[PDB]
Design a protein around this ligand. Structure first.
Ligand code: 2JM
Ligand code: 2JM
Ligand code: CL
Ligand code: CL
Ligand code: K
Ligand code: K
Ligand code: K
Ligand code: K
Ligand code: K
Ligand code: K
Ligand code: K
Ligand code: K
Ligand code: K
Ligand code: K
Ligand code: K
Ligand code: K
Lengths: 208, 208
């Protein structure tokens, strides 16, 4: 209870409405109702701060703010600097995923608490193959969603490793791929889509 | 010119209409206009034969029919038994992909002709990871579409290998993954989606 800090990445496609609520608020509220969650650090341009501070008084979590950075890992680092000195888990979430279920968030929190690092994923429905640099097929795969859940010590150690050795963070060379510490994949729901198109937004409403 | 036989897998989500033409006819017509294409072998339940034989007289290819099998590889084998004794390439296509562009089909035909086996693919937009049997992340990926283009000798040799050794054909352990012969991945278009949902069908119309 009150052990988890959420870093909510909200820095424009995550403020466009879905039944008249900006997409970013769906997951915001889902996290605010979970007794495990102590605080939510929203990482957004100071413009849209009010979109969230409006509800500060009704929600049952502390709210905090951080400024976005250049790339997604900068924004996480920025959020991390504002979490509570004693939180046991950091829960990083892309606000463009509105439909994450409370039950799936409980699952990945539990797994992150057990393993140290966990991510919600689903089996990749497409036929996916590795291709080499000559465009030839190189003779089980999962799609990663968010939350991505990590103990704060591990995250901080991960940022230090990258800075200390000027490592390259690609989308698929994560910070955690550099650590030897294991990352668990918690099985989520195919309904936890990311919103980036109007046809995504039709799906969103079809699902709600 | 007239060197390619198409095996069109059409064996119900590929007959539902898209601007009032059953989905299966879009690619059927795309192939029928290409001078390279000699014949199209439609693999469908004898029910819907008429959906295609109606146009037999206007299209500029020979039309042939084969009966579906248990699994997708059975239906390809069934189609293969009806191709022309002298075709140089077999072009296998899922009729649930209506929007394949003529230019992308020309590309994968050329690559299959050069390499012996080619498939239209696109870089996988999701973050995809390998996961082991303990659900831990195992520390370039492409989504395969169709056509899948293969010289007929190679396909036949591939079917013989599987039967000869009772190998297991999963969706992702293809017949071609058993061969030592290389498979080229021709870069396609993200618009070459597969139709399986109404939201897919909204995308289809949004794209046309
Ligand atoms: O990708 C992760 C997985 Br998979 C599991 C736990 C944490 C992460 C993660 N996500 C981001 Br954005 C950062 Br920076 C980090 Br570390
Ligand atoms: O997957 C393929 C690639 Br990738 C490239 C060429 C041919 C194939 C293929 N597709 C199917 Br269905 C069969 Br049976 C075969 Br062999
Ligand atoms: Cl990411
Ligand atoms: Cl397949
Ligand atoms: K709470
Ligand atoms: K979602
Ligand atoms: K959201
Ligand atoms: K979910
Ligand atoms: K445990
Ligand atoms: K999308
Ligand atoms: K033709
Ligand atoms: K298509
Ligand atoms: K079609
Ligand atoms: K295409
Ligand atoms: K060549
Ligand atoms: K789909």
């Amino acid at each position: 209870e009150k052990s988890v800090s959420v870093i909510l990445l909200a820095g424009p496609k995550q403020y466009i409405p879905l039944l008249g609520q900006p997409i970013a608020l769906y997951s915001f509220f889902t996290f605010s109702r979970m007794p495990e969650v102590k605080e939510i650090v929203v990482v957004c341009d100071p413009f849209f701060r009010d979109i969230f501070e409006e509800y500060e008084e009704s929600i049952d979590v502390d709210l905090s703010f951080a400024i976005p950075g250049k790339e997604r890992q900068d924004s996480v680092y920025s959020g991390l600097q504002e979490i509570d000195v004693n939180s046991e888990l950091v829960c990083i979430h892309d606000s463009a995923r509105p439909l994450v279920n409370t039950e799936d968030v409980e699952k990945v929190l539990k797994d992150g608490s057990a393993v140290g690092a966990a991510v919600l994923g689903v089996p990749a429905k497409a036929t996916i193959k590795e291709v080499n640099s000559d465009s030839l097929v190189v003779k089980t795969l999962w799609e990663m969603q968010t939350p991505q859940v990590i103990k704060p010590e591990l995250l901080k150690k991960g940022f230090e490793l990258v800075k200390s050795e000027g490592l390259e963070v690609t989308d698929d060379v994560s910070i955690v791929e550099y650590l030897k510490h294991p990352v668990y994949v918690s099985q989520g729901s195919y309904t936890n889509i990311k919103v980036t198109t109007p046809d995504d937004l039709l799906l969103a409403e079809r699902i709600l």
